[PDB]
Amino acid sequence: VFDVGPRYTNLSYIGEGAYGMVCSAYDNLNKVRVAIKKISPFEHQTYCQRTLREIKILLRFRHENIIGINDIIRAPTIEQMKDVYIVQDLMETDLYKLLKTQHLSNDHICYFLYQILRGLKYIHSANVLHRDLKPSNLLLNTTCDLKICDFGLARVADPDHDHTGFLTEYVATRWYRAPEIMLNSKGYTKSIDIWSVGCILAEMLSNRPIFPGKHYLDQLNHILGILGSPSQEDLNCIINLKARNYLLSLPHKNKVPWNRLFPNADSKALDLLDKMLTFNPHKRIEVEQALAHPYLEQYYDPSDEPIAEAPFKFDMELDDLPKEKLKELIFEETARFQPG
Numbered sequence: 001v002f003d004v005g006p007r008y009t010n011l012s013y014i015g016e017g018a019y020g021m022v023c024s025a026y027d028n029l030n031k032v033r034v035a036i037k038k039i040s041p042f043e044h045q046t047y048c049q050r051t052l053r054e055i056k057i058l059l060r061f062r063h064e065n066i067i068g069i070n071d072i073i074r075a076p077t078i079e080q081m082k083d084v085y086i087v088q089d090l091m092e093t094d095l096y097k098l099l100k101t102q103h104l105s106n107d108h109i110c111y112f113l114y115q116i117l118r119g120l121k122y123i124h125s126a127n128v129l130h131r132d133l134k135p136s137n138l139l140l141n142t143t144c145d146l147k148i149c150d151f152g153l154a155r156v157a158d159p160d161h162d163h164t165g166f167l168t169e170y171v172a173t174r175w176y177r178a179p180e181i182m183l184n185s186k187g188y189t190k191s192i193d194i195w196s197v198g199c200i201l202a203e204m205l206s207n208r209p210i211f212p213g214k215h216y217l218d219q220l221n222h223i224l225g226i227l228g229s230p231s232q233e234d235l236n237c238i239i240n241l242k243a244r245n246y247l248l249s250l251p252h253k254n255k256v257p258w259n260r261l262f263p264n265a266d267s268k269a270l271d272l273l274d275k276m277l278t279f280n281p282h283k284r285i286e287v288e289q290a291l292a293h294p295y296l297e298q299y300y301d302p303s304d305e306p307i308a309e310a311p312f313k314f315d316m317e318l319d320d321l322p323k324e325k326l327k328e329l330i331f332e333e334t335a336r337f338q339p340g
């Protein structure tokens with residue numbers, strides 16, 4: 001069932017996830033095609049938490065490089081609400097699909113990276129982390145406008161509670177995971193997103209994922225295979241006994257030069273890549289620094305890189321709420337879109 005009538009008709013498949021599906025549809029009010037994401041999260045607490053976070057975040061945000069929510073469709077009562085549909089702008093493709101079919105020139109890479117970082121500056125200024133940046137979540141049109149989508153794994157930043165043990169399970173897409181995820185981090189600091197952006201830049205440079213780990217620890221094998229052995233100083237910052245012991249046990253690995261991996265890339269793009277793909281998250285470049293990097297000099301304009309008016313100042317505290325209370329919160333958050 002894709003129950004979005006009567007305003008939205010002539011449905012066509014786009015993609016799907018574990019508990020949702022996105023289709024294109026014709027909007028019979030504005031006479032334009034739109035994207036509609038059906039979400040069916042109510043049987044699981046975790047899915048309810050993610051759905052609620054995405055809706056709350058996207059409804060507060062207003063930025064050219066971030067997908068918005070134009071409409072939310074759901075039943076008039078909690079009892080009758082089994083699914084929720086989110087209406088968004090329809091784009092033409094995503095960076096994942098684009099990279100299967102063509103090699104991007106440097107000036108397209110530069111302009112796309114600029115937009116990713118512009119959008120990320122706004123997200124981070126709101127004290128929010130995206131936590132699942134990857135090519136399929138970067139939507140594009142023929143005018144080369146780029147929008148960040150899929151905030152289902154987003155969280156309010158919590159650097160004071162980022163610590164976790166060695167080899168702790170993680171939810172976000174493997175290939176875009178920072179090394180610290182596998183060593184000592186829950187992915188609750190802004191630096192997690194900068195690593196993912198670095199991976200995306202590398203992927204735009206060669207049309208191949210830079211660290212295609214086949215399984216959980218293999219992801220760290222791929223990262224260390226290019227960055228080489230971490231310095232003593234970086235090891236001194238590693239926190240966990242088990243993470244330190246693991247890294248000290250490895251044979252010495254020298255770094256693979258970015259210009260040997262990417263022999264046709266712009267030298268300024270590789271300098272910025274090096275700074276985003278820095279092993280130690282405390283030394284990794286921040287979003288505002290990345291925007292100010294010489295690679296992006298032609299687009300850099302802090303006056304035209306807006307920040308959020310209303311950041312999320314507190315944790316949402318959804319972790320111990322039962323799925324029934326979360327359904328009530330999702331119902332209340334979506335009430336503004338009901339007729340009348």
Ligand SMILES: Cc1cc(-c2n[nH]c3cc(NC(=O)NCc4ccccc4)ncc23)ccn1
Binds near residue numbers: 035088090091094151
């Ligand atoms: C033709 C085309 C359009 C789009 C596209 N336009 N607008 C969109 C909005 C969204 N939103 C969105 O939240 N997508 C992620 C998702 C989808 C389904 C299940 C779980 C997560 N996704 C794709 C799109 C993406 C790719 N090709």
